[PDB]
Amino acid sequence: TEQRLNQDTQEAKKWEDRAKLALTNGEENLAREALARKKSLTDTAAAYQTQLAQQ
Amino acid sequence: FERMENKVLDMEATSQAAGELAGFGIENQFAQLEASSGVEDELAALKAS
Incomplete structure (x- = not known):
């Protein structure tokens, strides 16, 4: 889950x-x-951060 | 001749089919902006040499 977080953040x-x-x-x-696209990646990254904190 | 002209418009319609395919290419087009500036940047260096 920490790898997915680094992929979606980059x-x-x-x-x-x-x-x-x-x-x-x-x-424009x-x-x-x-x-x-940036917003959906930062919002899913916050879901992965939450998942990672529980893990 | 008139019915054959209606048949000729099948080729014209096929040209618009390639245009809709090109529509996907317009979303992809940002790569061409970097490609075009890159070739002028090395060309400017080659002209300066």
Whole structure:
């Protein structure tokens, strides 16, 4: 579960870089889409943090 | 000729089918922004050399 947490947290960093790239390219609609992927990864990472604390 | 023209529009319709496939390519397109800037960055270095 600690491996899944590190995978989804580095996937959130990847999407944050895609959001930065979209904003420099003026594609604000893709920046919002990337931020939505980032949010679902940080919210599932909090579920894995909870699972890991119990474990 | 008119019914054959209706048959010719089957090729035109097939062109839009490739356009819907290209729609998936538009979501993938951010990779082309990094690809295009990269080739100009090494080309600028090659021109400067």
